[PDB]
């Protein structure tokens, strides 16, 4: 009697996976270097993508944990008295305002939930519920966005998970301060429908299912081939 | 009251996190057919086994078909392979093999079904033989007959079912293991030869399906070895 409790959907898909690693400075520089942005999608981490693409429809809540590690950056006019750093983490729902640079107005919108995190404490966590117009997420979509056979093929507008933005609240007068963000994504209360056969050919694109024709398995020397064998001895003789 | 290790981020913990979007009335769910409660419901469906992957058929469907030919040969082998799912080059790509390859330990038995794709007027016999883990494969028909075997008649029946048993010392065996001449062997031997009336084609084909039985289980999830990419696409 062997238990079957580790192979359930929950115990299979509820593993935290580092899905995004980014870096962003604090002091003056090119504006696009002063904030970190990530669009939520389970289609760029190939291992997690192959785990997810084993089913057709999925329904889950999202738990996101952010790990931030910052150090001073070498240069002239260094600081000796930097009190403490504070980071702002922003979740933008689909259709909400999206900042185009640091020190923008969109960082003050009351509709986008924010977390103000000061270094030294435990990593910041949030949990997004199942937000969608439809009734489930679809890994595969065979159709078009518009009903007149025009638009991107295989793109469903219903599923969208938003964006995540990170910036330095501190306006640091002297010294550049580089920070590193690692995102940990994990579904909870996972429901899966319509199992599908797992993929065979390597992924080439993050938006299509395009592929190259690969072989079905690894070659063998002959049809009636069982290698290793046994040398003559106490048993084989 | 508190240890310094009480405040930490452990990647394998389950503590409820505060909600970021309250008062958001989620969309009620609907009854979509085809729900899955366990991955073991995926590993008990028959899939075709490429037993004929002889380095020239892996780029075609010819690998899926075992060819049986009619002639004067009587004591010649049909096919033969080793029964170690998940690591054997024959099984490692089917559904059983891949669901095994996600995990690290497994235990159970395997059902093999052979189907005879041939004329309705063909008649012959076969001597499907199985050898225990602690033995060498039979070399000729007589040795295979004296072991554990089954005489499959393609006249009375069109399909043959064979259930490999579960023999081991420990509770869970490994997926990748230094498993030499100690796992098992399944072979097929010509018993009489294929007979056809005037008009039926001489040659025929055999197809094989493999699935897991109801005792089957796995443990110690890990990463699959088939993925070979470390860069985020695009």
């Amino acid at each position: 009697y062997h238990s079957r409790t580790e192979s359930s959907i929950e115990n299979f898909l509820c593993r935290a996976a580092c899905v995004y690693i980014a870096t962003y400075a604090s002091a003056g520089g090119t504006p696009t270097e002063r904030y970190a942005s990530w669009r939520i999608n389970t289609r760029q981490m190939v291992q997690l993508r192959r785990k997810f693409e084993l089913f057709t429809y999925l329904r889950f809540d999202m738990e996101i944990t952010f790990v931030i590690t910052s150090t001073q950056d070498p240069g002239t006019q260094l600081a000796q008295d930097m009190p403490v750093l504070t980071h702002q983490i922003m979740y933008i729902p689909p259709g909400g305002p999206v900042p185009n640079s640091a020190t923008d107005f969109a960082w003050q919108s009351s509709t986008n939930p924010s977390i103000f995190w000061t270094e030294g404490c435990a990593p910041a966590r949030m949990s997004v519920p199942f937000i969608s117009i439809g009734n489930a997420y679809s890994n595969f979509y065979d159709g078009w966005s518009h009903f007149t056979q025009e638009g991107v093929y295989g793109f469903n507008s219903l599923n969208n998970m938003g964006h995540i933005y990170v910036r330095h609240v501190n306006e640091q007068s002297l010294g550049v301060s580089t920070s590193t963000l690692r995102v940990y994504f994990k579904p909870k209360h996972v429901r899966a429908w319509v199992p599908r056969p797992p993929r065979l050919s390597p992924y080439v694109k993050s938006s299509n299912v395009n592929f190259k024709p690969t072989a079905v398995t690894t070659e063998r020397k002959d049809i009636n081939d069982v290698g290793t064998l046994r040398p003559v001895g106490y048993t084989n003789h | 009251m508190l240890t310094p290790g009480s405040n930490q981020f452990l990647t394998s913990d389950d503590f409820q996190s505060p909600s970021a979007m309250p008062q958001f009335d989620v969309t009620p769910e609907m009854k979509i057919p085809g729900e899955v409660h366990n991955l073991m419901e995926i590993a008990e469906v028959d899939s075709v086994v490429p037993v004929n992957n002889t380095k020239e058929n892996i780029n075609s469907m010819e690998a899926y078909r075992i060819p049986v030919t009619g002639g004067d040969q009587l004591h010649t082998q049909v096919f033969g392979f080793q029964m170690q799912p998940g690591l054997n080059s024959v099984f490692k790509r089917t559904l059983l093999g891949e669901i095994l390859n996600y995990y690290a330990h497994w235990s159970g038995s395997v059902k093999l079904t052979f189907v005879f794709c041939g004329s309705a007027m063909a008649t012959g016999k076969f001597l499907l033989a199985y050898s225990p883990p602690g033995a060498s494969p039979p070399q000729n028909r007589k040795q295979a007959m004296l072991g554990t075997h089954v005489i499959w008649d393609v006249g009375l029946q069109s399909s043959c079912v064979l259930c490999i048993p579960w023999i081991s010392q420990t509770h869970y065996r490994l997926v990748q293991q230094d498993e030499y001449t100690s796992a098992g062997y399944v072979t097929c031997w010509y018993q009489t030869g294929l007979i056809v009336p005037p008009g039926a084609p001489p040659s025929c084909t055999i197809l094989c399906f493999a699935s897991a039985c109801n005792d089957f289980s796995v443990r110690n999830l890990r990463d699959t070895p088939f993925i070979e990419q470390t860069q985020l696409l695009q």
């Epitope: 064998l229 046994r230 040398p231 003559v232 001895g233 106490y234 084989n236 003789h237 | 230094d178 030499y180």
Partner: antibody, heavy 117, light 114 residues
Framework: EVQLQQSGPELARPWASVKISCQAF???????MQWVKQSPGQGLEWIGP????????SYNQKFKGKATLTADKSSSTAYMQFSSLTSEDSAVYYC???????????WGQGTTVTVSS | YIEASQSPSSLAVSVGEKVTMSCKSS????????????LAWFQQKPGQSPKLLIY???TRESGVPDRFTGSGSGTDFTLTISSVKAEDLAVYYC?????????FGGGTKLKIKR
Amino acid sequence: EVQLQQSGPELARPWASVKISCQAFYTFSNYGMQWVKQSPGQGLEWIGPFYPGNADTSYNQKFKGKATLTADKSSSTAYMQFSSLTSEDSAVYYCARVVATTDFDYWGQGTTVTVSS
Amino acid sequence: YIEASQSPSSLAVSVGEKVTMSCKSSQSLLYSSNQKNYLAWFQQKPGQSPKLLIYWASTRESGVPDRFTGSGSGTDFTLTISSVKAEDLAVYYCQQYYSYPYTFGGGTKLKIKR
């Protein structure tokens, strides 16, 4: 460096069964002895091994149904029995023997079985 | 069956020169658990009983001169003599003891160049 002897060469006749004995000066615990065929045209060819202390007797597939093997541990002898002999079997038979599953360190002496039809 | 092919031709070199030879085999003979090669370097004196030089292709037999060395693993099996001689004329074979049949080598007679 321990020596080894066997029956010896005789001039036989067609269809004459010729057993070639082999003496012993060793121990009989999982050790073995067999023979070879030294023919200049046929190179080196073994015929069949006996396994004292194991009761395992096999033959080369080129002579199954032709040759058989017998032995006596107390008498310390081994015998190849021939049947349906041909005139081209004439070769120098060496009693190869080894105290090992895998080695050839003790060799025979030589035996000529040339016939005259 | 499990056979082997010796060197295509004999030494055909002068007296007193080192000789490097090969005996390719139709099947690999390296076993993982034993880590040993099942082949032996033979030496058949013309007119007398044979006797091998190296057993396991790495251990020189007690009574073998330092000149003869066996090498090679798997399908390849080679031989190296630091000095060829005239009075030790023989027919060098490579006989495997891996599994039935106990097939012998190909034949290599030490010819005359003097």
